[PDB]
Structure formats: C-alpha cells, structure tokens
Amino acid sequence: MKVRASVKKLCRNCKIVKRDGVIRVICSAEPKHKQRQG
Amino acid sequence: IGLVGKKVGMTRIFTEDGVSIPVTVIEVEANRVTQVKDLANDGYRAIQVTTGAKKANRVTKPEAGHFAKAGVEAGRGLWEFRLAEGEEFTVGQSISVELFADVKKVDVTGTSKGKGFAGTVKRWNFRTQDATHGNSLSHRVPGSIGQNQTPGKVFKGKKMAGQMGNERVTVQSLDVVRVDAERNLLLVKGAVPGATGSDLIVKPAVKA
Amino acid sequence: SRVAKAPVVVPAGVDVKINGQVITIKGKNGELTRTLNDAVEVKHNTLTFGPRDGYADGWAQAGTARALLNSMVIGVTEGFTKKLQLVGVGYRAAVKGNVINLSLGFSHPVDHQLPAGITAECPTQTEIVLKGADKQVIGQVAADLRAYRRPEPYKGKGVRYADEVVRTKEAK
Amino acid sequence: MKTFTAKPETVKRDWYVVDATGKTLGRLATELARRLRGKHKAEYTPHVDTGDYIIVLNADKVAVTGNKRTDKVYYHHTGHIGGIKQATFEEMIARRPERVIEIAVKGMLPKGPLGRAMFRKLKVYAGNEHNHAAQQPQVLDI
RNA sequence: GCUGAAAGCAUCUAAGCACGAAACUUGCCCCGAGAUGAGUUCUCCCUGACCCUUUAAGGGUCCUGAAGGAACGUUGAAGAC
RNA sequence: GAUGUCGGCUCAUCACAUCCUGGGGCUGAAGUAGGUCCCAAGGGUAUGGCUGUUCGCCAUUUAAAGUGGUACGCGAGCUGG
RNA sequence: GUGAAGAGGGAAACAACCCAGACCGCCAGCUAAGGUCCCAAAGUCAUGGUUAAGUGGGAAACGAUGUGGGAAGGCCCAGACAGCGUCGAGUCGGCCUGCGCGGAAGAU
Ligand SMILES: C=C[C@]1(C)C[C@@H](OC(=O)CS[C@H]2C[C@H]3CC[C@@H](C2)N3C)[C@]2(C)[C@H](C)CC[C@]3(CCC(=O)[C@H]32)[C@@H](C)[C@@H]1O
Numbered sequence: 001m002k003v004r005a006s007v008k009k010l011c012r013n014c015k016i017v018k019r020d021g022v023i024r025v026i027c028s029a030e031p032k033h034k035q036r037q038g
Numbered sequence: 039i040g041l042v043g044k045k046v047g048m049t050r051i052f053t054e055d056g057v058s059i060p061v062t063v064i065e066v067e068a069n070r071v072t073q074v075k076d077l078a079n080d081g082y083r084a085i086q087v088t089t090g091a092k093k094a095n096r097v098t099k100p101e102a103g104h105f106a107k108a109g110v111e112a113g114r115g116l117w118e119f120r121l122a123e124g125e126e127f128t129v130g131q132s133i134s135v136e137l138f139a140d141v142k143k144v145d146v147t148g149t150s151k152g153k154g155f156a157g158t159v160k161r162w163n164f165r166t167q168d169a170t171h172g173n174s175l176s177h178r179v180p181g182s183i184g185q186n187q188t189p190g191k192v193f194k195g196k197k198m199a200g201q202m203g204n205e206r207v208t209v210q211s212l213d214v215v216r217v218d219a220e221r222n223l224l225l226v227k228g229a230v231p232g233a234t235g236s237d238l239i240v241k242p243a244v245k246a
Numbered sequence: 247s248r249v250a251k252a253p254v255v256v257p258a259g260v261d262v263k264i265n266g267q268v269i270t271i272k273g274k275n276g277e278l279t280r281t282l283n284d285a286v287e288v289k290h291n292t293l294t295f296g297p298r299d300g301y302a303d304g305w306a307q308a309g310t311a312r313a314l315l316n317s318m319v320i321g322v323t324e325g326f327t328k329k330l331q332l333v334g335v336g337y338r339a340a341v342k343g344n345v346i347n348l349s350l351g352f353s354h355p356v357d358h359q360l361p362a363g364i365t366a367e368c369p370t371q372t373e374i375v376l377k378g379a380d381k382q383v384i385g386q387v388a389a390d391l392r393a394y395r396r397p398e399p400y401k402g403k404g405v406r407y408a409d410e411v412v413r414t415k416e417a418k
Numbered sequence: 419m420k421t422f423t424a425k426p427e428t429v430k431r432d433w434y435v436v437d438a439t440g441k442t443l444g445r446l447a448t449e450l451a452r453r454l455r456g457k458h459k460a461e462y463t464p465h466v467d468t469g470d471y472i473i474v475l476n477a478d479k480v481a482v483t484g485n486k487r488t489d490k491v492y493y494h495h496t497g498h499i500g501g502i503k504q505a506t507f508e509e510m511i512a513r514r515p516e517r518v519i520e521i522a523v524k525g526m527l528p529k530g531p532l533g534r535a536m537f538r539k540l541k542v543y544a545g546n547e548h549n550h551a552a553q554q555p556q557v558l559d560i
Numbered sequence: 561g562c563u564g565a566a567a568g569c570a571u572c573u574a575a576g577c578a579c580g581a582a583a584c585u586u587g588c589c590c591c592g593a594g595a596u597g598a599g600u601u602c603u604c605c606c607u608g609a610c611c612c613u614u615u616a617a618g619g620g621u622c623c624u625g626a627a628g629g630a631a632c633g634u635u636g637a638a639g640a641c
Numbered sequence: 642g643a644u645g646u647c648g649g650c651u652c653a654u655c656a657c658a659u660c661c662u663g664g665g666g667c668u669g670a671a672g673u674a675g676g677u678c679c680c681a682a683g684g685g686u687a688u689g690g691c692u693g694u695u696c697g698c699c700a701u702u703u704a705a706a707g708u709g710g711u712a713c714g715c716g717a718g719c720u721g722g
Numbered sequence: 723g724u725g726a727a728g729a730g731g732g733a734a735a736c737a738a739c740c741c742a743g744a745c746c747g748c749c750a751g752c753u754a755a756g757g758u759c760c761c762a763a764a765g766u767c768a769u770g771g772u773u774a775a776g777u778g779g780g781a782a783a784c785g786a787u788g789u790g791g792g793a794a795g796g797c798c799c800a801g802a803c804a805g806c807g808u809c810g811a812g813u814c815g816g817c818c819u820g821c822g823c824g825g826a827a828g829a830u
Pocket residue numbers: 643644645646
C-alpha cells in the first residue's frame with residue numbers, strides 16, 4: 001500500500017474507488033499500484 | 039462459592055521425593071448458611087454464611103434475631119458468597135472444607151498486616167537519596183512531587199507517605215496441598231495475607 | 247438502472263412471497279428470505295424492480311434488489327457451487343458432517359464448521375466443493391476456507407478458488 | 419405596582435409522561451428543558467422552579483441524525499491525571515441509556531442550585547414502564 | 561474480504577453481511593451509596609398520662625429511658641492522635 | 642520594591658512524529674532475516690570507563706536501550722562538580 | 723479612527739474591532755451592531771435552493787467516477803457505450819461554475 005496525498009491510476013488495470021470516505025487505487029495487475037489517499 | 043476460615047499459621051509439608059512445600063494452614067470450620075439472597079427479593083443470588091462461635095453477651099439483639107431466623111448458632115461474623123448459575127443452598131445448611139476436596143487452586147482473601155504510617159521508601163519502593171555526598175536532611179524524603187507552574191499542582195494518585203497495610207488483599211491461584219475435612223483444615227501452598235488468627239476468605243481460583 | 251429494469255423471471259416450482267419490504271423465495275433447494283432496502287418496490291409472473299418515491303438513491307437500491315432476488319430465485323431453483331483446490335505437499339481436506347477438517351501445513355488441526363445451508367464434499371483430498379442456496383454465504387465460506395492458507399506468490403501453495411489465476415513470481 | 423413573582427411554597431407542578439421513542443435527542447431535550455424550567459407558564463420566575471415533573475419513557479429508543487449514533491462522543495475526566503474517558507452514543511445507549519437524555523437536558527438547564535433542582539424533576543426510564551402511577555402523569559406529546 | 565448496484569462490466573460499500581491488534585469496553589484486583597440520584601436486604605426496639613396557646617411537622621409538664629450507643633477499664637500481629 | 646540558573650539526584654506527568662512488544666500493505670518478500678509504509682501510546686524501554694558535563698566516544702549488556710513537551714518538568718525536595 | 727482621557731450593547735471571555743458618546747430618576751416605548759432551539763431576551767418564521775462533510779465549527783500545493791447548476795461537443799436504432807457478429811439505449815470526457823472530500827501529527 002502506497003499512502004500518498006496524490007493517488008493516481010498508474011496503469012490501464014488501476015481503478016479509482018472511494019471506500020469509507022477514502023480515495024483508493026486498486027489494481028488487478030500490479031500490487032505495487034495499490035494506493036490509499038492519506 | 040467459597041468458605042470463611044482462620045489463618046492458623048505456616049508450616050511445611052515434606053514430600054516423599056524431598057520437596058518442602060511451604061503451607062499456610064487455614065482452619066475452615068463449618069460455614070452455616072444464615073441467608074439465601076434471590077433475584078426476586080434481593081436482586082442477586084448469594085448465600086450469607088457464618089462460622090465460629092460468638093459469646094451471647096457480644097451478640098446484639100439484631101444479630102441474634104438474624105441467626106434465630108436462620109436457625110443457626112451465632113458465629114463470629116457474616117460473609118456473603120455470590121452463587122453460580124447452577125448452585126443452590128438452603129438456610130441452615132452447613133458447608134464444610136470438603137467443598138475444596140477436588141479444587142486444585144484457591145484465591146485467599148484476608149486483611150494484610152498493618153504497617154501504620156509508612157514512608158515512600160517502604161510504601162512505594164522509592165529510592166533513597168545519597169546517605170553522604172553533602173545530602174542535607176533528605177535521605178528518605180520523597181524528592182520532587184510535581185513539575186512547575188505547568189501544571190502548578192500535584193496529580194491525584196501521587197505516591198506519598200501514608201497508611202500501609204491493614205487492607206483487603208487477595209492472593210490468587212494458590213495450590214491446594216491438602217483438604218483435611220476431619221480436622222477442618224485446608225493447607226495451601228505459600229503465604230496468604232494477614233496475621234495468625236485473622237479471618238480468611240478462600241474461593242476456588244478465578245483465573246485457571 | 248439497466249439491472250433493475252430487467253424483471254427476474256420466476257421458474258416453475260419456486261413460489262414467491264412478498265410482504266412489506268421482506269421477500270421470501272421458496273423452491274426445491276430451500277427457502278431464502280431478505281428484507282429489501284426501504285427505497286425499493288418489488289412487483290410480482292416475474293418480480294419487477296423499480297424505485298420507491300422520496301428516496302435519492304432509488305435506482306441504485308433497485309439494481310441491487312434485482313441482483314439479490316435473481317440470485318435468490320436461482321438459489322432455491324438451481325443452487326450455487328464453489329470449488330476450492332488445495333496446492334502444497336501434504337495439504338489435504340476431508341468433511342465429517344458439517345465440519346471440514348483441513349490439513350494446511352500447520353502444527354495443529356484446522357476444523358471449519360460449515361454454516362447451516364452449506365453442504366460440502368471432498369472429491370479427493372485436494373478439493374472441496376461447497377453447495378448451497380445463498381450466493382453470499384457460499385462465497386463467505388469459500389473466502390473463510392481460502393483465508394486459512396491464501397495462495398502464496400512463489401509456488402502457488404494454499405487454498406485457492408478453483409477458478410482463480412494465482413499469479414506466481416520468482417524469488418530474488 | 420410590583421411585577422408578580424411565583425412563590426416556591428405555592429407553585430403548582432404537574433406530572434407529565436413523554437415517550438422518547440424515535441424523537442430527535444436535542445429537539446426533545448429543549449422541550450424538556452423548557453418545561454422543567456417552567457418557561458411555558460405565565461408565572462415563569464427566573465429564581466423559582468415553576469416547572470413540571472416529566473417522566474421520559476423509552477430513553478433507549480431516542481434518535482439522532484447523521485452518523486451521530488456511532489460518531490457522537492461523550493467525554494468525561496475522572497479527576498486523575500490521564501483520566502480522559504470517552505463513550506460513543508451507541509455505547510452510552512447500550513450501557514446507561516437514561517444518561518443520554520439526562521446529559522442532553524442537564525446542559526440545556528441553568529447552571530447553579532436552581533438548575534440542579536430543576537433537573538431533579540426529570541425522571542428518565544430506559545423502557546416503557548414507570549413507578550409513578552400514583553402521581554397520575556398526563557401524556558405529553560413532543 | 562463476501563454478496564452487490566449506482567455505472568448491462570468491474571467494484572470490500574452505496575443497502576446488506578463477515579473477519580481483524582498489547583490501543584477501547586469488559587473480564588482480574590482494590591476502593592466505593594456524601595451515588596444529596598444519599599439505593600437494597602435481614603434482624604432488633606419503643607404501643608404512657610396531661611394541660612396550654614400562636615390550633616400546628618406548635619409548645620411545655622409528669623411519667624417512661626427500649627434496641628443500641630458511648631464512656632470508663634484490661635487491651636491488640638490495629639494505631640501518630 | 643528579585644520569576645534561583647547548567648549538569649546530576651529524587652520523583653515524575655503528558656504527546657506520538659513508535660525504540661521494543663502487538664496488528665497489517667508493498668517489497669528488488671524463497672526461508673531465515675531485512676527494507677519501506679500504514680495502524681497502534683497497553684506496558685516496557687542498560688550498567689559502566691572518561692569528562693562538571695547534557696551530549697559524545699568507548700566497553701559490555703538488552704526485546705528495546707524511542708523522540709519530544711512539562712519555567713530547556715522538579716534547589717520553600719537534595720547536591721553544588 | 724478608537725483607546726489613552728470613554729461607561730453602555732455586540733464580538734464566549736477580549737483598552738485599541740463593530741454599534742454607540744453615560745446630567746439625574748422611571749418595574750414605559752422604538753431601534754443600532756448583533757441576534758431569535760435550550761443555557762439566554764426574541765422566528766423550532768415563510769418560500770426556493772445547496773451540503774451529508776458535524777462541512778458548518780482551523781490548515782496549502784496537489785489528488786479524486788462525491789454531489790448540484792450552466793453552455794457546448796464527439797459517437798448513436800446505417801445499432802452507439804460496456805459485457806459476451808450479438809445487444810436494443812443512450813454513451814463518452816473536456817469546459818465553466820456552487821457546495822462538499824482527502825491532503826490534516828503534540829504535549830494536564
Ligand atoms: C539575582 C537574581 C536571580 C537569583 C538569578 C538570575 O541570574 C542572574 O541574574 C544572573 S547575574 C548573577 C545573579 C546573582 C546575584 C549576583 C550574581 C550575578 N549572582 C550570584 C536568573 C537565573 C536570571 C538570569 C534572571 C531572572 C531570575 C529569576 C528567574 C531566573 O532564572 C533568575 C532572577 C530574578 C533571580 O532572582
């Protein structure tokens with residue numbers, strides 16, 4: 001998990017999702033792309 | 039439940055394999071049930087027991103009538119034990135140390151020996167300051183008791199000199215060495231609170 | 247929306263019992279039931295799904311309500327299947343009644359009591375096949391069984407969903 | 419002439435029963451506070467308790483808006499250093515549901531001897547029963 | 561994480577459901593009803609005359625003196641008092 | 642028309658930007674053992690040599706030898722290098 | 723300009739800000755700033771919107787299918803967009819703007 005102020009889609013397979021008031025990047029392809037805004 | 043006993047003193051049991059077990063000898067005479075508390079009347083489940091034998095002149099008329107209602111002799115006091123979900127007892131029932139026959143560990147509650155007014159060194163294990171190297175009148179004194187203007191007060195619970203001991207203490211999870219129902223004796227491994235002669239409340243160990 | 251607009255067809259066999267918000271679906275494979283979100287209207291052939299008035303979400307709640315009752319209809323009718331595979335030397339599974347007993351390379355037994363509604367059988371030691379009416383419950387049990395030893399990224403060892411692609415990488 | 423003052427020894431205090439079920443905590447509390455103080459009476463006198471006895475039933479079913487059931491926090495300090503304690507609304511409801519209403523009303527009553535006296539006339543119950551049928555409380559809708 | 565729409569897909573979340581830490585609430589120990597919101601239970605004790613005036617939780621007398629308490633004494637592994 | 646000062650000693654108390662122990666994501670994470678980030682303040686968190694030292698270096702421990710605030714906490718508490 | 727040398731009302735508290743300049747008395751009335759759910763005087767006032775963050779009631783670059791409004795496009799029943807030729811209705815992402823969200827750690 002990357003915890004960052006700037007969370008972004010890093011590839012095609014990244015998806016932005018808001019869960020419990022938190023913007024997250026989930027990625028089917030690359031676990032390194034998983035991000036939480038914070 | 040538990041039973042009320044008396045600290046007789048300490049001794050040892052030598053085992054066949056050459057271990058000396060330090061034991062507190064607890065005299066557990068018959069605990070007579072004086073009152074059964076229920077949810078309807080009292081709002082909780084408990085027995086009140088008495089033990090020993092008080093002398094008629096020292097038994098007040100209020101005390102006498104309470105014992106007389108139960109149909110038991112006056113003992114030296116009254117103690118309550120909360121009842122488990124299953125447990126049932128009747129008024130006037132006598133409960134012996136046989137209660138503890140299969141109990142492996144007990145919690146023993148007593149009143150600790152009274153040390154009176156105790157300094158911080160004794161009471162709280164404070165370190166002494168220098169005996170020499172210039173120390174002026176401040177060998178066993180507590181040192182600083184706070185900070186400065188912030189907070190400008192001493193905090194509650196500050197460890198200071200005062201009354202030590204002469205208070206309720208429970209020692210938990212003492213091994214039952216021997217239940218001698220014939221002599222009204224319970225032998226527990228190790229020390230328990232209070233002086234020889236003091237009342238002890240013995241209960242099966244809560245922890246296990 | 248496009249989910250909710252589609253009405254769930256009723257197969258024969260499986261009776262529906264709406265009341266208030268709570269719906270009941272009973273067939274050959276048991277009797278499921280759900281209280282739907284109070285913003286939802288269901289309308290019995292075919293259960294329709296559309297939005298109730300005075301409710302901002304509405305079509306969102308109706309689309310889930312649809313999707314839930316589609317699965318409920320399919321659940322009491324056909325039922326749902328999940329298969330887990332075990333991977334790893336000496337990893338085995340075996341069912342004793344409603345308890346799965348998994349050997350997963352631990353220094354102790356692992357015994358998952360399967361919840362009511364879920365049946366399980368092991369076609370061989372390295373396969374569980376769960377069966378039940380609730381799609382949610384059978385998914386939850388499968389997830390619980392997977393969680394004992396999640397598929398690991400070097401050699402793929404653990405409890406996997408039989409479908410799942412376990413991405414494996416090489417050691418540094 | 420001199421303006422009327424209520425006299426504590428001659429004040430008429432009536433008994434009321436309120437159902438807290440589904441009421442917004444704060445909007446109930448203000449109406450309770452008003453009536454405990456006696457602001458609803460023409461005989462209202464700031465230095466006299468002219469208010470009414472109020473039984474509140476079903477305190478455990480009092481409602482809050484938003485995320486306040488989980489997120490409204492009740493703080494108290496024990497007086498011991500580091501002794502800041504907290505409980506959420508839902509925890510307060512589970513443990514001591516009468517305290518939710520009582521705390522809400524207490525903060526809306528005057529501070530000082532009279533405000534404390536006013537609060538004593540509030541009788542909050544977790545459930546639907548009270549022991550005060552002898553006082554003959556009239557239903558009061560809020 | 562499950563199920564799952566909004567957004568035919570996907571999505572742990574919006575509805576719903578499940579896990580999840582020495583933190584939190586308990587569980588363990590001690591204090592604790594001045595908790596003036598002063599709680600409960602059990603037991604014990606007292607079942608006399610009389611007259612005023614401000615007729616009222618009014619006042620005084622004669623008789624009575626309970627339960628129990630205190631005091632005093634002998635004291636204590638209780639204690640500065 | 643005085644708000645006693647460095648360091649030590651005694652006694653602390655809070656914050657969390659966490660040193661250890663607890664939970665977790667990613668790893669250029671095989672394992673072992675790390676790296677990094679997130680959660681977490683319950684409790685715990687060296688003794689000596691040298692020097693007035695704080696610090697530092699050094700020796701040898703430890704699960705760890707946390708970082709700060711508190712009149713650079715604490716002389717109507719001690720010391721006075 | 724005010725304080726100094728200026729009281730009163732408001733800004734929780736608060737010389738210097740806002741309102742306003744106290745000759746004395748009144749248990750009359752109207753207003754100012756500021757207010758009107760309870761503490762605490764006065765709208766739980768009316769109508770139309772926005773916000774779901776207790777935002778309101780602390781904090782930037784920057785990040786984001788939060789959500790409202792406006793103008794204009796691309797592609798689309800010569801079948802678009804997504805899922806798997808099929809499928810039958812919209813879809814796509816820039817622009818301007820309102821209100822929110824993360825960014826956001828401190829000592830009694
Ligand atoms: C006499 C004043 C002292 C005791 C000490 C003072 O320290 C000095 O003033 C340094 S000069 C030094 C003071 C004394 C008296 C003469 C000689 C010179 N030395 C022995 C010192 C440390 C400050 C710097 C100034 C303020 C002080 C109050 C708080 C504080 O820390 C004090 C004064 C108000 C205090 O009374």
